[PDB]
Design a protein around this ligand. Structure first.
Ligand SMILES: *[C@@H]1O[C@H](CO)[C@@H](O[C@@H]2O[C@H](CO)[C@@H](O)[C@H](O)[C@H]2NC(C)=O)[C@H](O)[C@H]1NC(C)=O
Ligand SMILES: *[C@@H]1O[C@H](CO)[C@@H](O[C@@H]2O[C@H](CO)[C@@H](O)[C@H](O)[C@H]2NC(C)=O)[C@H](O)[C@H]1NC(C)=O
Ligand SMILES: *[C@@H]1O[C@H](CO)[C@@H](O[C@@H]2O[C@H](CO)[C@@H](O)[C@H](O)[C@H]2NC(C)=O)[C@H](O)[C@H]1NC(C)=O
Ligand SMILES: CC(=O)N[C@@H]1[C@@H](O)[C@H](O)[C@@H](CO)O[C@H]1O
Ligand SMILES: *[C@@H]1O[C@H](CO)[C@@H](O)[C@H](O)[C@H]1NC(C)=O
Ligand SMILES: *[C@@H]1O[C@H](CO)[C@@H](O)[C@H](O)[C@H]1NC(C)=O
Ligand SMILES: *[C@@H]1O[C@H](CO)[C@@H](O)[C@H](O)[C@H]1NC(C)=O
Ligand SMILES: *[C@@H]1O[C@H](CO)[C@@H](O)[C@H](O)[C@H]1NC(C)=O
Ligand SMILES: *[C@@H]1O[C@H](CO)[C@@H](O)[C@H](O)[C@H]1NC(C)=O
Ligand SMILES: *[C@@H]1O[C@H](CO)[C@@H](O)[C@H](O)[C@H]1NC(C)=O
Ligand SMILES: *[C@@H]1O[C@H](CO)[C@@H](O)[C@H](O)[C@H]1NC(C)=O
Ligand SMILES: *[C@@H]1O[C@H](CO)[C@@H](O)[C@H](O)[C@H]1NC(C)=O
Ligand SMILES: *[C@@H]1O[C@H](CO)[C@@H](O)[C@H](O)[C@H]1NC(C)=O
Lengths: 165, 98, 416, 196
């Protein structure tokens, strides 16, 4: 930074100090807050395994069987070159699953490719059909709750009730 | 599934403290043991500057009948650093200290 | 120019490509609330855990939104079982589907139009942004599939497997689907491809000249960023404490009494998180409503031909093409618009041997001397016949019936 | 049902929080203190609790609009899908819509959509039109196809071929204007019928 000779420190929009002058040397220091992020646990059901993998979100694989995802440093999952349907989503195209056993992590498949046998003179016509039934579910209502605000705050209490009024 | 469970955070490895590397003791004695204090209608005042200010010397002193902090607490005075200090001075009846 | 004897019919027509932009997801924010409110203080945290579950509730609430933004981007784009692909030979009956199909030369398989869109749209306080589950390279493969299936197989890949069909025969089914007969394509197929390939040109000219159309995506990114920047600015506010900086109060006051100052900030900051999370929950329902409109358009318009008037731009809908965009989707709707039209004369029915005749399709017109039956949405005047018309009642029953001679081709074929 | 269970499980547990008071229990404070300080303890519990309700009620108001947007969608399906037939593609399951049967469920509805799906298919050669007299013929319904030795007209969505006739084809223009047109005989029923 090009600090002017009068400036003891500099600050970001949050009023957090970004940089400082040292009181015992004519030097200007940048300050970067310490590396942090969500610890996310990737698990199958406890019915099926107590193995887990851990995703340290947004840290470069340093400060924590380790793999970098764009979501974070993923610890305890085996990288795979094949791709599969998603199972547990991780982020930025990465998905993980419990398969033959340990947790594997992979870029998810979108489904099979199927290039089309197109030409300006050929058509496919159905010779036969399947009638198919599909279930579709929709919620329609909640539980009709009601709450007595007065009783919730000041149960049996005239003292409280006089303060709530 | 994937569960957000806690927050990872790199801890400080070492502890650093820095102050202007000097040694002059502040003129607190020239105030708190002065040969003369002013009338309150014309209250006196000294600017304390360019010095290490040990406040423990004052805070422990039984000669003070009251010693009362408002923007800071007394044990913190030795931890803190200042750009300016102004000690205003006068003489009132002991009742009007309130 | 309304009257009880007059009709106007299009003698010409214009294909128009429109553009429609919908937002589909937000920036997937999350926060560590405790680090926002009382970051780097075990004592502030001890004060905050007297307020109980609010920190956990706000984390659940912001997580509930982020887990839905994956679902929205999935339900709009992931409407297909298989990544269909186009042939290397672009035999699409004269349509230049090169500007909206993938570009194989770039690091991400986006189209020529998508690359305009991604360039028309524009930290430590426990705040974070989670990545979307699908990368833009995955969205660009889903729009590659949906578009490649649309061009090579029409709507048939919506219903089951893609059934290939020639593009100018898919477009004949399209035209037939708006009451305009298959021959109106083939008698003009080079003109329809000229108007279409020219209109896809006007779309690039429009999108390349100005960002101003993409306000529907940019307003979302701007609202997300202003609400994040306000959550950050409210860390600096006093709420009536002796400093807003927690570390000032932790240097200047002893615990027995510092706790009465810090409570101001804990309460003030917590109200400033409950405000942000409420804004984002109402907002996420605004984006949810749009992702469900986008999923409904991609189902009915792209994967089909819609009949819903003005649901897929102005005109009669032929087909539409999805293109991805940053946090959104862009539809290029292709519509038949009646162009040049003129008004002459018309009648509800005609009279023959005392009986009355009505058109099997189309409507009777007179050029001012003779009578014809034409398909309604494009001028194509046929001789009036017992093939083009059907019978009910007699001349005395109908209001406004006219005098005319009907040709039955069985008469010459018996007479010869 | 779980989101409403979590909502009340939190609303209940927020009674047990102090919000800055000496105890989580209102009768403990009123057993322990006189009005000079009991009111200045209890205003803490009101400022906490009341904000705990204005939070819960906000979540219910936002949620109820997310359920109303599914009740309005369910009523739009029970209108268009059950009481009708829908041309709206993939709105009523994957495939072409035939009919759907509604079923009740706890706080919900379930639709059993019946769809026709194309399952087995053959490749055919095709052309947009055929030439007879140098006059050009088009399908009235369905599409032209060939097995490779003969030409048939057939319905688009189920292979059921017919010999090409003046009853199945309409005419416009001449064979020069169409692109990719082919020559084939059109059967006129009337020639055998006149000659008999
Ligand atoms: C479809 O149209 C595009 C133009 O919109 C054609 O791309 C151009 O090709 C010429 C050479 O034929 C180049 O000089 C131009 O620079 C290209 N334009 C751009 C913007 O790159 C494309 O070749 C046409 N494709 C077909 C199959 O006709
Ligand atoms: C349309 O033409 C018919 C003839 O085909 C007209 O019918 C005749 O009307 C006159 C009276 O004006 C009668 O004397 C004739 O006996 C009618 N002939 C038949 C065959 O009906 C009819 O009036 C004309 N209508 C208009 C509006 O010009
Ligand atoms: C295309 O279909 C026609 C029938 O519509 C096939 O021709 C028939 O073949 C059977 C079996 O030998 C004969 O009994 C019929 O008399 C034939 N009909 C006619 C009109 O010739 C024809 O072989 C099929 N072509 C292919 C390549 O499968
Ligand atoms: C059936 C009917 O409405 N016929 C009327 C006709 O009587 C009137 O003279 C004419 C005026 O232009 O408009 C038409
Ligand atoms: C700190 O000490 C160094 C070494 O004696 C000296 O050069 C420097 O000027 C001092 N800094 C201040 C602010 O007094
Ligand atoms: C886990 O679920 C399977 C059914 O998939 C069941 O057979 C098994 O007994 C269950 N195990 C436990 C420990 O519940
Ligand atoms: C951290 O990751 C980046 C990736 O671009 C790399 O350039 C950098 O050298 C890495 N640093 C360490 C200490 O591994
Ligand atoms: C994946 O396969 C490539 C060869 O295509 C190989 O170089 C790479 O090391 C393999 N990675 C793993 C994790 O097996
Ligand atoms: C003033 O003098 C007394 C001794 O009489 C001493 O105890 C006290 O600390 C002195 N005050 C200051 C401020 O130095
Ligand atoms: C029909 O439109 C033409 C213009 O194309 C106009 O001259 C004519 O007067 C209109 N007829 C009526 C009845 O308004
Ligand atoms: C329709 O009008 C346009 C001019 O806008 C012309 O280029 C086109 O050839 C006309 N089409 C027909 C079928 O007459
Ligand atoms: C259509 O022909 C292609 C020729 O490459 C073939 O691969 C495809 O399986 C055929 N489709 C059907 C339904 O038989
Ligand atoms: C179909 O495309 C081929 C080139 O592969 C061309 O020779 C043929 O004439 C075209 N036919 C039609 C009807 O467009």
């Amino acid at each position: 930074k090009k600090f002017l000779p009068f400036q003891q420190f500099g600050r970001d929009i949050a009023d957090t100090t970004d940089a400082v002058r040292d009181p015992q040397t004519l030097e200007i220091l940048d300050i970067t807050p310490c590396s942090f992020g969500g610890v996310s646990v990737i698990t199958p059901g406890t019915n099926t395994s107590n193995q887990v993998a851990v995703l340290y979100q947004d840290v470069n694989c340093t400060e924590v069987n380790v793999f970098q995802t764009r979501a974070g440093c993923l610890i305890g999952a085996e990288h795979v070159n094949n791709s599969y349907e998603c199972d547990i989503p991780i982020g930025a195209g990465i998905c993980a699953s419990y398969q033959t056993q340990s947790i594997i992590a992979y870029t998810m498949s979108l489904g099979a490719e199927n290039s089309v046998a197109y030409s300006n003179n050929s058509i496919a016509i159905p010779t036969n059909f399947t009638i198919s039934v599909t279930t579709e579910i929709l919620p329609v209502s909640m539980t009709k709750t009601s709450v007595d605000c007065t009783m919730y705050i000041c149960g049996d209490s005239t003292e409280c009730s006089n303060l709530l009024l | 599934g994937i569960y957000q469970t806690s927050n990872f955070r790199v801890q400080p490895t070492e502890s650093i403290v820095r102050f202007p590397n000097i040694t002059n003791l502040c003129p607190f004695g020239e105030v708190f043991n002065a040969t003369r204090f002013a009338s309150v209608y014309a209250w006196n005042r000294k600017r304390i500057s360019n010095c290490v200010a040990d406040y423990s010397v004052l805070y422990n002193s039984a000669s003070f009948s009251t010693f009362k902090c408002y923007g800071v607490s007394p044990t913190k005075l030795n931890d803190l650093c200042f750009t300016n200090v102004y000690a205003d001075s006068f003489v009132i009846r002991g009742d009007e200290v309130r | 120019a309304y009257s009880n004897n007059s009709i106007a019919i299009p003698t010409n027509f214009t294909i128009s490509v429109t553009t429609e932009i919908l937002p589909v997801s937000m920036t997937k924010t999350s926060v560590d609330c405790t680090m926002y409110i009382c970051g780097d203080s075990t004592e502030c945290s001890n004060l905050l855990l007297q307020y109980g579950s609010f920190c956990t509730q706000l984390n659940r609430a912001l997580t509930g939104i982020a887990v839905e933004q994956d679902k929205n981007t999935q339900e709009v784009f992931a409407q297909v079982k298989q990544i269909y692909k186009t042939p290397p030979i672009k035999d699409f009956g004269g349509f230049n589907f090169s500007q909206i199909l993938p570009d194989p030369s770039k690091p991400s398989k986006r189209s020529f139009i998508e690359d305009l869109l991604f360039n028309k749209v524009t930290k430590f306080n426990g705040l974070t942004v989670l990545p979307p589950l699908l990368t833009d390279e995955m969205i660009a493969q889903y729009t590659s599939a949906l578009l490649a299936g649309t061009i090579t197989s029409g709507w048939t890949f919506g219903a089951g497997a893609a059934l290939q069909i020639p593009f100018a025969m898919q477009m004949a089914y399209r035209f037939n689907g708006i009451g305009v007969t298959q021959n109106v394509l083939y008698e003009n197929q080079k003109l329809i491809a000229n108007q279409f390939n020219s209109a896809i040109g006007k779309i690039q000219d429009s999108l390349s000249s100005t960002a101003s159309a993409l306000g529907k995506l940019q307003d979302v990114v701007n609202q997300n960023a202003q609400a994040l920047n306000t959550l950050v600015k409210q860390l600096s506010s006093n709420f009536g404490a002796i400093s807003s900086v927690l570390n000032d109060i932790l240097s200047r006051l002893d615990p027995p009494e510092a706790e009465v100052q810090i409570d101001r900030l804990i309460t003030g900051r917590l109200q400033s998180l409950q405000t942000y999370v409420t804004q984002q929950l109402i907002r996420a329902a605004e984006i949810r409503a749009s992702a469900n409109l986008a999923a409904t358009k991609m189902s009915e318009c792209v994967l089909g031909q819609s009949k819903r008037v003005d649901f897929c731009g102005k005109g009669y809908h032929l087909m539409s093409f999805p293109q991805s965009a940053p946090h959104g989707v862009v539809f290029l709707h292709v519509t038949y618009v009646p162009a040049q039209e003129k008004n002459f004369t018309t009648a509800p029915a005609i009279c023959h041997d005392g009986k009355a005749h009505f058109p099997r399709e189309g409507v009777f017109v007179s050029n001012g001397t003779h009578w014809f039956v034409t398909q309604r949405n494009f001028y194509e005047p046929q001789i009036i016949t017992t093939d083009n018309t059907f019978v009910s009642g007699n001349c005395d029953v109908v209001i406004g019936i006219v005098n005319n001679t009907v040709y039955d081709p069985l008469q010459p074929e018996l007479d010869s």
